[PDB]
Design a binder for this molecule. Structure first.
Ligand code: NA
Ligand code: NA
Ligand code: NA
Length: 480
């Protein structure tokens, strides 16, 4: 009934490869809903390069842990039946399901093929650095164990335009297939960032365009998805992602939420992409991720008044999926920009108690990351989810007027009893700030849901209250 939406990435990079994750998800459904989670982003659910693959080394998009391929039947997360069972549990508990979609490349080809290719400048793929010669690339996919179930489409080298490994001479190089063009338009870092890893798909081919559109529809129907999380889209021709998304919404009866991962610490680049998409999807707020990271790294000297500056949520709140960390930013991973424990509570309060943006909770933060001795922050997050789910409603007032202490308020809405809140925090010494929470809340006494400050704040006759916060901390006051 108008409840704020909250997404949760249900996995972390170092999850154990025990094949019991879908089952865990299934048993956690009710608890997650009660906690305030309304949507779950599941990891790539199809067969990857190997059983332990996190899912991005995608081998067979039609094998959801159902066929014996790549050395295993189940994926790292479990079997097809356990996933379907988990999804059913999510639906019955009012939780939307977003499926991760990996279409930029394929990995784990069954055999190599001889291909004329040229080496290109890694920092400028538009420039060849060698003449054309024949290499042996891993491009042949037969999906043997699937027996053509669902689809008899087979992949070959002519469906791709590049790889980063030559099996003939056993060397690593960024290869562009001779007589093939890099996809366009794509991100321009390194000149043309079409190629990332694995066997890079060339969408110029109509057969490729149709195959992935048809697979998408099949995947959507098979799992009854409510949306998707589009992987590495800055490496995929923009025109195609738009075509694909429009195609899926046309084939599915249910609404489909779409959030793309355009990984770049540049809001303008993201806005450019959204213009190209005619704003038909949201994008993860990568700049905000880096804002949080810069703050975490610098300490109190960071000017909190700029915490949201340059972020996507700041400019287009309706098209931004906000987050603090993910499987790519956690320690040791490729896009590391981990927010330390001290600043993490402030970052989560920022995405969970504000009116703009569609916030996402990271599994690694919620349950911790054992591999790196990172504690579970479930207690802290649940209090902020309680705030979001039951109190973050109504007109918002911002107070980013001090370099250390900042905050904002929500007047609450008649639709939700006792809703309304006041968030105040400091990345340096503690302090206080008078903020307006709505004259309709006069006479109420508000207390901190996080327990970080025992102050009791009574709202005066004009609807103003003075809220307190300790140093390097965050408090969220509500009429509890
Ligand atoms: Na690409
Ligand atoms: Na981060
Ligand atoms: Na500061």
């Amino acid at each position: 009934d108008g409840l704020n939406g909250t997404m949760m990435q249900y996995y972390e990079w170092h999850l154990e490869n025990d094949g019991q994750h879908w089952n865990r998800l299934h048993d956690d459904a009710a608890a997650l809903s009660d906690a305030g989670i309304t949507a779950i982003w599941i990891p790539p659910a199809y067969k990857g390069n190997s059983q332990a693959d996190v899912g991005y080394g995608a081998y067979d998009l039609y094998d959801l842990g159902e066929f014996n391929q790549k050395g295993t039947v189940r994926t790292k997360y479990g079997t097809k039946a356990q996933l379907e069972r988990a999804i059913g549990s999510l639906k019955s508990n009012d939780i939307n399901v977003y499926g991760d979609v990996v279409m930029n490349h394929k990995m784990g080809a069954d055999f190599t093929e001889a291909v004329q290719a040229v080496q290109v400048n890694p920092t400028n793929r538009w420039q060849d650095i060698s003449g054309a010669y024949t290499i042996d690339a891993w491009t042949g996919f037969d999906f043997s164990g699937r027996n053509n179930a669902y689809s008899d489409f087979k992949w070959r080298w002519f469906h791709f335009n590049g790889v980063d490994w030559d099996q003939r001479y056993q060397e690593n190089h960024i290869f562009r297939f001779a007589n093939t063009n890099w996809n366009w338009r794509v991100d321009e870092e390194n000149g043309n960032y079409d190629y990332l890893l694995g066997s890079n798909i060339d969408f110029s081919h109509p057969e490729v365009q149709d195959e992935l559109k048809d697979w998408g529809s099949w995947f959507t129907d098979e799992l009854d998805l409510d949306g998707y999380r589009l992987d590495a889209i800055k490496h995929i021709p923009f025109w195609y992602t738009s075509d694909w998304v429009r195609h899926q919404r046309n084939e599915a009866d249910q609404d489909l939420f779409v959030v793309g991962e355009y990984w770049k610490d540049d809001v303008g680049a993201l806005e450019f992409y959204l213009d190209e998409m005619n704003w038909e999807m949201s994008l993860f707020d990568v700049p905000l991720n880096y804002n949080f990271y810069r703050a975490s790294q610098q300490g109190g000297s960071y000017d909190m008044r700029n915490i949201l500056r340059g972020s996507l949520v700041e400019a287009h709140p309706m098209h931004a999926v906000t987050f603090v960390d993910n499987h790519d930013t956690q320690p040791g991973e490729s896009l590391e920009s981990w927010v330390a424990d001290w600043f993490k509570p402030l970052a989560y309060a920022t995405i969970l108690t504000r009116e703009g943006g569609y916030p996402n909770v990271f599994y690694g933060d919620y349950y911790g990351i054992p591999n790196d001795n990172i504690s579970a922050k479930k207690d802290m997050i649940d209090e902020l989810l309680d705030a979001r789910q039951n109190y973050a409603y109504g007109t918002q007032h911002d107070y980013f007027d001090h370099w250390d202490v900042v905050g904002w308020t929500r007047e609450g809405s008649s639709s939700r009893p006792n809703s309304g809140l006041a968030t105040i925090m400091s990345n340096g010494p503690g302090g206080s700030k008078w903020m307006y929470v709505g004259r309709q809340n006069a006479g109420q006494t508000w207390t901190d849901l996080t327990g970080n400050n025992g102050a009791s704040v009574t709202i005066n006759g004009d609807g103003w209250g003075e809220f307190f916060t300790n140093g390097g901390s965050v408090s969220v006051y509500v009429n509890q």
